[PDB]
Design a protein around this ligand. Structure first.
Ligand SMILES: Cc1cccc(C)c1OCC(=O)N[C@@H](Cc1ccccc1)[C@@H](O)C[C@H](Cc1ccccc1)NC(=O)[C@H](C(C)C)N1CCCNC1=O
Lengths: 99, 99
């Protein structure tokens, strides 16, 4: 799609058999989602860092659908004020900024 | 331009007679820039909010050039870990997310 930015670019993602809402966040390197139980191995990742890091679980090669774009990418699972689709997944969906 | 998101979408902005780097941040409602002296009236704005707000100065109708695109928009001036072009200015430059 073409998403204008008058509103927060919140998109529906499908991940871990759940439909979630997430913000297409070009300011985020990574994709951080709250409350998904992703299967399989993960490794700890420290994210944030300003005032301390937040430990999240990094799951790699996660199938995630973003606006009916099935991609695969790293999803960090842990506390996030809002579910964020970061650049890592936006590149997968071939999402670009255009002006 | 079409900006792919493999890297942080840092763009050069021209504001307050200065060339600055700023992140095209679709996750940011507002544009927050540090160390720009903007002329004229401003009103305080509280931004952030998680753990407390940061007070910044809201300058309205600021001429700002983003990747050569002259636009006018609200620029919040105050502490920001990175200069952020938020959606408010991305709409002005006609920046959209596309995939
Ligand atoms: C910067 C970074 C480094 C390593 C790894 C990752 C994933 C990184 O990126 C993630 C990140 O923190 N991104 C921020 C930028 C960053 C760079 C440097 C230090 C810290 C962060 C920023 O761009 C987007 C971020 C959206 C956000 C989403 C969920 C929780 C919190 C914030 N947007 C916002 O914070 C704004 C501000 C003004 C309040 N915002 C979010 C509330 C509602 N209003 C609003 O407009």
């Amino acid at each position: 799609p073409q998403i204008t930015l008058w509103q927060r670019p919140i998109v529906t993602i499908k991940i871990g058999g759940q439909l979630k809402e997430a913000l297409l966040n070009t300011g985020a390197d990574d994709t951080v989602l709250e409350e998904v139980n992703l299967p399989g191995r993960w490794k700890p990742k420290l994210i944030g860092g300003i005032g301390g890091f937040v430990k999240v679980r990094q799951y790699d090669q996660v199938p995630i659908e973003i606006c009916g774009h099935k991609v695969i990418g790293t999803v960090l699972v842990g506390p996030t004020p809002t579910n964020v689709i970061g650049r890592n997944l936006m590149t997968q969906i071939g999402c670009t900024l255009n002006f």
